[PDB]
């Protein structure tokens, strides 16, 4: 159970074995990972859809019918398929909700601590929706962080997965009633076990040398 | 069971033990982690700065001014500090860097297949920097994905870390001459070991209930 090995061994599955499914335990482990991911000020500006039924994966895959047909198969054949969603705008409600939760779990000693945490959360939230007018992308950024967390996490569970950015968010939004609830699709991640039609399992892993992307000071 | 415990036990350390440094192997491991993270089309539109010296860390801490004082401590007290940077504009010279390392690592069986990815990568990049004119946030989204992978990874190594968004991007960029190289800092991640002053090490992890963030279908 060494994380580097799993980091060097994991890959983007290009073909899933429709027959091999997720344990009801692994199915639970998948939702736990999504939920427990960190976020700026613990804003958790996301929403997830975890397709488990063929009727569900088809609903999702329905967004890959365009010029992303090669992606369609990964969706339908994989055990579970999660489509990460980000909030469209950071509202005062979601903010009150987060702090009310942190309080419910006992993260505040005095009511003054609770207030100081809320003012700090609103400081950052405001500099985004009021100063820089980027709360939508700031929120989308955290969702991606959640994905990086997820990809490594499932890989460490001995599961295969692949981050799909090639899909019509517009079609997916409409198909699930998103945007109405204040959300958008950003990444689709089919999870399960790979089949022999997956070429990327035999191919070596590649990244640019550290002498180009990294500076030590 | 394995990464899940890691995921639920990890926390945003608020105070570091300066004397507690990373072991020689741990230092190489965090670097590997930064390197093998996935990214859309394997574009790796990122750059990292790892400060391990006392001089390096102070230079990064320079960005912890104004209303970001509460983060200066962690940037100096932590064993190593990683500055996550994204490219400011995706140019063909880099798309050529990626494809050349993929060809060199032995992923392409036929020269037709290499030209097949170059086109795939280009088409994806083209619709971002031309049509939507948002390649700056697209590359930035990839960096956050890398951070998520990093946060869980260092935690799996038994290391402490806190993702910092509270710093001055201009000071960090200027202090390192990033704009001229084509980069901008997004997230700062000091990593080492927590001190007993870390009030967050003993506090309970708070997250929203799954009945709000997750829709199982
Ligand atoms: C992108 C990002 C930026 C953050 N910025 C800061 C920061 O500037 N300073 C800090 O002390 N914590 C920062 N946090 C830590 C969050 O408050 C923390 O991740 C969140 O409350 C969840 O707590 P946990 O990491 O203990 O699970 C940041 C987290 C993320 C993901
Ligand atoms: C955000 C994102 C989007 C990607 N889009 C796709 C996609 O639509 N289809 C696909 O097969 N792979 C996709 N990839 C997988 C990448 O090509 C892959 O992560 C990269 O080549 C590095 O290889 P690895 O995943 O084996 O480490 C994507 C990856 C990420 C992180």
From Swiss-Prot, chains A, B:
NAD(+) binds at residues 14, 41, 71, 74, 107. Its EC number is 1.-.-.-, 1.5.1.34. The keyword Phosphoprotein does not apply. It catalyses: 5,6,7,8-tetrahydropteridine + NAD(+) = 6,7-dihydropteridine + NADH + H(+); 5,6,7,8-tetrahydropteridine + NADP(+) = 6,7-dihydropteridine + NADPH + H(+). GO terms for cellular component: cytosol; membrane. Its cofactor is FMN. Subject to competitive inhibition by dicoumarol, nicotinic acid and acetate with respect to NADH. Subject to uncompetitive inhibition by dicoumarol, nicotinic acid and acetate with respect to nitrofurazone and nitrofurantoin. Keywords: Flavoprotein, FMN, NAD, NADP, Oxidoreductase. Belongs to the nitroreductase family. Reduction of a variety of nitroaromatic compounds using NADH (and to lesser extent NADPH) as source of reducing equivalents; two electrons are transferred. Capable of reducing nitrofurazone, quinones and the anti-tumor agent CB1954 (5-(aziridin-1-yl)-2,4-dinitrobenzamide). The reduction of CB1954 results in the generation of cytotoxic species. Homodimer. This is Oxygen-insensitive NAD(P)H nitroreductase. It comes from Escherichia coli (strain K12). The lineage of its organism: Bacteria, Pseudomonadati, Pseudomonadota, Gammaproteobacteria, Enterobacterales.
């Amino acid at each position: 159970m060494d994380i580097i090995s799993v980091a060097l061994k994991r890959h983007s599955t290009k073909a899933f074995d429709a027959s091999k499914k997720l344990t009801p335990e692994q199915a639970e482990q998948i939702k736990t990972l999504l939920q427990y991911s960190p976020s700026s000020t613990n804003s958790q500006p996301w929403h997830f859809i975890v397709a488990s039924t063929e009727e569900g994966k088809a609903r999702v895959a329905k967004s890959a019918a365009g010029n992303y047909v090669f992606n369609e198969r990964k969706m339908l054949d994989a055990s579970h398929v999660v489509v990460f969603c980000a909030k469209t705008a950071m509202d005062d409600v979601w903010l009150k909700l987060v702090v009310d939760q942190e309080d419910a779990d006992g993260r505040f000693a005095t009511p003054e601590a609770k207030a100081a945490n809320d003012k700090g959360r609103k400081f950052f939230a405001d500099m985004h929706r009021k100063d820089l007018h980027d709360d939508a992308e700031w929120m989308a950024k955290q969702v991606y962080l959640n994905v990086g967390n997820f990809l490594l996490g499932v890989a460490a569970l001995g599961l295969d997965a692949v981050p799909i950015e090639g899909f019509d968010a517009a079609i997916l939004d409409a198909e699930f009633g998103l945007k109405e609830k204040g959300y958008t699709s950003l990444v689709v991640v089919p999870v399960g076990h790979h089949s022999v039609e997956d070429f990327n399992a035999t191919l070596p892993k590649s990244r640019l040398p550290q002498n180009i992307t990294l500076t030590e000071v």
